Symmetry: C3
Subunit: 486 residues, 3 copies
């Protein structure tokens, strides 16, 4: 005969490379980036409740150093701690520092309950030139520096507090470390001193350390802070013959501990986001991010890859003939379509049903990549100033392992998605072609290039009947059969 109908698919001048199981660069018409690499320049104060430490890290917040008054009564989902935090009080350290920091941050509030402690015969409310408050010598406002009396006495202290409330209590207490033996006896009479804090099932006892040390805020002495949790029904004893930095009460512990801490210089802005990193919040719908392993809230999974491209279109093939060799750059209002050549000339029209089928499957894939919120809050430290050994080895190894596994998952996921997407769109093309083959029945012959040679005169109107499925092959059959075989 001579009128020809072709089936084919769209194509663009320049597409995007994606990966599959079998190769790392297959060009497809459209693609979607799955790794978020952009963050906001600020931290969003909504909807998570953020509290800014400003000059106070969370530990001198609990101790009550000068400049930390704004944190009294505070409640947070995320405590924002500044790397710029400045010391304003007595030089201290904290054995197992990170555990106290963790407990304070996880707890999520500063609610202090003043208690009267009947210390006997010793001086109270010791103050320091290294801890000026409102330009006067002062001290941590949650702590009480006991010293020997003017009569030169420091008798054994032995105070019990019973937890008969309905919440667990957190006591913070310290041990003072003088610079010389002379200082030890000048302050506490007894040498050595001893600080002992006991519950029903535990006991921390500390012998003070004596010796000259580097000047810190003018001083060679130090305080080491410790803490004790007291469950309801439990008791705590404070027992000393010297060097106790006494609590003035206790912090309330929440039963549910759901909060956390983020150490970052990034300012708090006005945006809205439930995902925070140390580099700023993230506002995205992508499932992965390469911005930071440190993240909090409703977040994308951290991976090592800078880019993972999800195919959102069929394979892109460059350019009458059908789909067996090429794609059609001219087809721009559909994914698949008909190209014809008859007496009245040529033309191209899109096929809606096959185009809509391929699009629905791709959107389906996209929606499935929207995971339900898997909100994470208190996790583990992921950056460290200096080496510590065993426990830090374990922490870095855990995070390193986790990241490798998720990066693998991401990599395999997009390869599998893309392989299927390509097969799905290849399959929609062949089904379109099969549909028409069966429409034409014995009236036409498969040319092999995705085109049917039709063996009867075919109108522009006869073409239209083929494309909308009203073509009745019986009408043309007699004529067609003997155009074909004779």
């Amino acid at each position: 005969g001579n009128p020809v109908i072709c089936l084919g698919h769209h194509a663009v001048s320049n597409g995007t490379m994606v990966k599959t199981l079998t190769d790392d660069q297959i060009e497809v018409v459209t693609a979607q980036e799955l790794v978020e690499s952009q963050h906001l320049p600020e931290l969003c104060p909504s909807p998570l409740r953020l509290v800014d430490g400003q000059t106070c890290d969370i530990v001198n917040g609990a101790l009550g150093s000068p400049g930390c008054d704004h944190l009294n009564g505070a409640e947070w989902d995320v405590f924002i701690e500044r790397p710029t935090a400045v010391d304003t009080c007595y030089p201290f350290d904290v054995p197992d520092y990170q555990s106290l920091r963790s407990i304070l941050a996880n707890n999520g509030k500063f609610e202090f309950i003043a208690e009267e402690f009947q210390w006997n015969t010793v001086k109270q409310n010791g103050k320091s030139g290294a801890c000026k408050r409102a330009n006067v010598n002062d001290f941590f406002n949650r702590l009480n520096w006991l010293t020997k009396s003017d009569g030169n006495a420091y008798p054994l202290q032995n105070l019990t507090k019973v937890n008969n409330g309905d919440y667990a209590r957190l006591y913070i207490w310290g041990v003072h470390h003088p610079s010389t033996d002379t200082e030890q006896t000048n302050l506490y009479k007894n040498n050595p001193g001893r600080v002992t804090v006991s519950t029903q099932t535990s006991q921390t006892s500390v012998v003070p350390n004596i010796g000259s040390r580097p000047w810190v805020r003018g001083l060679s002495s130090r305080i080491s802070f410790y803490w004790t949790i007291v469950e309801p029904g439990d008791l705590i004893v404070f027992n000393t013959i010297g060097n106790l930095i006494a609590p003035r009460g206790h912090y309330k512990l929440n039963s549910q501990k759901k909060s956390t801490i983020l150490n970052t210089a990034v300012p708090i802005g006005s945006c809205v986001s439930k995902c925070h990193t140390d580099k700023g919040s993230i506002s995205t719908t992508k499932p992965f991010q390469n911005i930071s392993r440190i993240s909090i809230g409703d977040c994308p999974k951290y991976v090592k890859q800078g880019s993972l491209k999800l195919a959102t279109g069929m394979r892109n093939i460059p350019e009458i003939a059908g789909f067996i060799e090429n794609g059609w750059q001219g087809l721009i209002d559909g994914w698949y379509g008909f190209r014809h050549q008859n007496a009245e000339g040529t033309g191209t029209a899109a096929d809606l049903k096959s185009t809509q089928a391929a699009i629905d499957q791709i959107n389906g894939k996209l929606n499935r990549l929207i995971e339900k919120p898997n909100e994470k809050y208190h996790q583990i430290e992921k950056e460290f100033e200096q080496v510590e050994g065993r426990i830090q080895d374990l922490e870095k190894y855990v995070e390193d392992t986790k990241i490798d596994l998720w990066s693998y998952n991401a990599e395999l996921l997009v390869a599998l998605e893309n392989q299927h997407t390509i097969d799905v769109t290849d399959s929609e093309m062949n089904k379109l072609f099969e549909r028409v083959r069966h429409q034409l029945r014995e009236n036409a012959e498969d040319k092999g290039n995705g085109c049917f040679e039709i063996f009867h005169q075919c109108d522009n109107s006869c073409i239209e009947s083929i494309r909308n499925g009203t073509y009745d092959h019986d009408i043309y059959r007699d004529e067609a059969i003997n155009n074909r075989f004779q």
Copy 2:
């Protein structure tokens, strides 16, 4: 040019929604749940060896507290520790309690070897009103409370035990802390006392802490317990001038520790199962469970999902015409089938080569799926009464991380399986169609809807020859061609 034979597949009234990579809800004929949500109200005492602590926790078992005698000589894969266990002996604490408990649990037995310690001049076998056995004062039966002689003497003790055997020895010993100086001298004469326990490479020196503890069951005196492991070829030394709570021997350590502990109130039953949780045993062949992260033995992976349905059958399309886009609800003795209409009438017959090819490919998925061990005994603690800091944060993070990784694995796997199953069953339908097409050769024409218009006369005789593959096309070729093209 009149008979029609159609190929199709079964369909049911109400299928089951499953998931693929592309779809959140696609309907299949049958499906299998992969997440176990049901557990037994009991713990199964076989094939794992369970020991019921009953009234004693495992640490009290090791010390030999009153009420713990049933544990003498016990061996276990899993020690069942009851939440209702109470302290019945002398008030004690254990500095690294969690680790002592873990070591005892992991070791898997209470095999005590008595040793005679030739203590000099001190009284042995001290007993107490705080540790009654049958309303008579007693003590931990693995421990030996040394006190001063009637002659008011507590001479230096210096006793050595060399390990010349072939296993490592666990020694448990304690230090007693009196309430007052008077109690100290009444018991041990010397004040202060000291206890020093050494091996070749290690030394533990404890100075008692007098009068710094709150009351427990009316006593503010307390014992602190320690442990020492002695490798073969090594030795242990006990050196004390007071307050030593001496061991009566040592426990044997198993160099291949593979036991653990489970804290639960769930009674031991008479079921059979290799998987235990704090909620009770699980008896299933499903590969996943959402019951508890605390599981021991040969267990299904714990996941977050409440349900993951695995398709065990083709797509369900409920409701003269073959398979192209609906299915036959009256096909019940096969998965795929022939439906015909000729002069003699109508009929449906199942094809079984096709039906079995599909079932065999599905069945294999299930056996691959429900396959190999997951043999895990001693793990880590996974629930916590109260925050502790760094190490517990790391323990929680490791577990939470593991669960997300397994939940992802479960989610993906079921989607991959279901996508494959759906392609497999679709493929089988089309292989069946192609088989018949190539049987008929030029005697029939593809009607486009999964049917063949047969252009010769065809009774029930030749219908079955089509269905059993004996149909000779050449017999009717002349008749059939004549009807096709005239």
Copy 3:
């Protein structure tokens, strides 16, 4: 119409079983093992830097014990610690030994920087019979044992070292624990002694514990060792009235610690490899290994599986509705088998074969792509039980190995099912490519053979195989033989 043309695929006498999502046993033509099970009987000294401790473990190397001098100035990616290392000096303990060992190992070098400490009036360079060099009393050569002068004098020592360099400093110092009070006053005059070491950001003090320990190398006394890190800008104060075992300088810390330690008896050889285990180096391109969970460098992932076979060819069918495969076909994967008047024959199609070959090579190189290098990890074997921290360390590693073993199983199954589907798809594509070359001049026998309904000599048979055969020329002849 009776010449017949057929399309099929290669087969072999016997090939290899593989696994997919559905079956644990599907025979394919060729396959590749993805799990390395063989190691070298030695450790490769290239291209990573290995340093052999010999008789010296790393902690003694840091202290400068006899037999560790060869470690002076050493730099490593992997410190090789021998299980037969023994103590050769004063008996000592290190509180948190494992952390010191780990820091020394991770740091990756023994770059010691000597300093003059102007100790006042005390005697220096004390030696012991328990620490013999040649055959003379000696000592840890990084340490300086201070004792009272000849005039019974040990004045308070108070020495400062300021860090005005651009690297963190590691100081290792010690506290001596005498066996008796008489030994204490004999050595240090004062009783008790006191050792206090402090920076701006950390402080400690150690009161010596006087008492007898079990005899070791003729002594009941002990030294306990400590370390202190001093950052740039910080400084350190050594303050003492007795029992200090003084540093003679400090070690330099790299800002970028990239090294680790391997404890193994395996000898260092002459081979080349970038993956090391406790059982020897591994030289392989395979992505997985079942040799050891302890591995360092550029290594395959450790998995529990002994074997994971990846299909590198199509299903192997002996001797669908293609027959099975052709064993006669051995210069391609897919080909043509015909029979006309002048005889039979078989030829291989290039593209279909090459297309399948290319897609399979693609998998292989995506698989064997394989970078990221891991050095310092965690300890994975333990001599005695410890409780909590060791429990977590073992649990982490167990979890990791399970997850990766699962990944390996899933991956191979997915690749195999795809490799099979692709190679069957390429067969069927070759078929209906030919179908459209014949048009109306041939029919589908239903077994992959086209009944050519016209006289088809060797040279129309080739014409089909080069894409030239014109279906017009024989159309009338064909139709006449088909319907007549």
